[PDB]
């Protein structure tokens, strides 16, 4: 048995971390290779047969791409500026805004406001949560990047809530092996869990 | 009216980048500054297609159309959970506990040492690595930037003997920088060569 999963930042950062450790504990005889990329390398990755899996927060329709929504995310509001609460997207302060480079993310939040152009872009979650940090700006990002970097105080739900929809992407002309399968159903078991949790300390 | 694009690796970009970056950021103003992580790989890329001004790595390109500063030399650590003394023989290493790095320049600089065999587990991003080592389930060699960042300094070792890789600011030969973005090069190089002067120094 052997597959290679590739994530977006914010989900490696600990989150695919923990369920592959507790997956590889409870079977061995498996090679396991991960990587965490932004989504455009994650897609040429599945193209070139370099990764077997992906975790983003697109669809594609690429080649025999297949892209299964598995999950919905909370997108939160952080900023080292206290806030009490819930926070209205009209209400944020577009002079601090740090525009975030996640495309599915940036076109979430223009469905809800068009920030203008600003000083700063980041387009790797966890450098925006270190700017975020310093005090250098706000910025609305997924729960998992937030929960990873900040302090509790420092994220907000949005108002009304905001969410991203979670994608396993796999090449269909592809076929998977019964350890994958059974990695692919583990993987969105924890996944999910997970979000169960996030829902309760995120309530206000 | 200024305007650069930076890319950086993963272990840079957990803290030193944006650390620098703000001081920079903060010091210039009517700047525009984009920046990102990315590997090896994709930042060349990205500065090959013009995505990207910049890019931080470990590696300097081949002939080409890219131009590679020489800032300084990073350390390479052990890490561990349960190792708990102090530097560490390549040659000790436990190969059954070994986490690959994939392919890549750190594997490269590990290879010249020596070859391990291959494992059950492949782990291609810093970061991720650390989480594994943190929760017990394997050993790496990784540079002293990720390395700080996710673990505590009980997991982290020198090698014996002293392992380093190179750090390099890569640009486009065939472009020229403003004047905004030389000085934000020069005020990186500078802050970057500084910071690796510490760190050189309390190991
Ligand atoms: O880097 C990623 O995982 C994509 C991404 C998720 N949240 C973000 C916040 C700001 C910029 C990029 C991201
Ligand atoms: O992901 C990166 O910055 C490259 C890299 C630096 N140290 C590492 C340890 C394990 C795997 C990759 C890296
Ligand atoms: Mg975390
Ligand atoms: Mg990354």
Redesign the pocket.
């Known amino acids: 048995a052997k597959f290679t999963l590739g994530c ?4 490696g950062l600990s989150l695919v971390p923990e369920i592959a450790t507790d997956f590889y504990q409870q079977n061995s005889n498996l090679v396991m290779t991960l990587t965490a990329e ?2 455009e390398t994650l897609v040429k990755k599945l193209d070139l047969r370099e990764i077997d899996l992906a975790l983003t ?1 697109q669809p594609v329709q690429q080649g025999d791409i297949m892209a299964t929504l598995i999950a919905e995310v909370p997108l939160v509001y952080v900023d080292k500026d206290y806030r009490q609460g819930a926070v209205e997207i009209d209400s944020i302060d577009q002079q601090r805004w ?1 525009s ?3 495309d599915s ?1 940036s076109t979430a939040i223009a469905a809800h406001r068009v920030f203008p152009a600003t000083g700063l872009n ?8 270190e700017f975020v940090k310093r005090g250098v700006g706000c ?4 729960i998992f ?1 937030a929960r990873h970097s900040l302090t509790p105080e420092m994220i907000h739900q949005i108002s009304p809530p905001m969410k991203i929809d979670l994608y396993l992407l796999r090449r269909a002309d592809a076929s998977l092996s019964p350890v994958t399968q059974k990695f692919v159903d583990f993987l969105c078991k924890r996944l999910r869990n997970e979000l169960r949790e996030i829902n309760l300390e995120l309530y206000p």
């Open positions: 977006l930042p914010c989900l932004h989504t927060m740090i975030p480079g996640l993310l980041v387009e790797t979650c966890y450098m925006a949560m910025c609305i990002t997924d990047s």
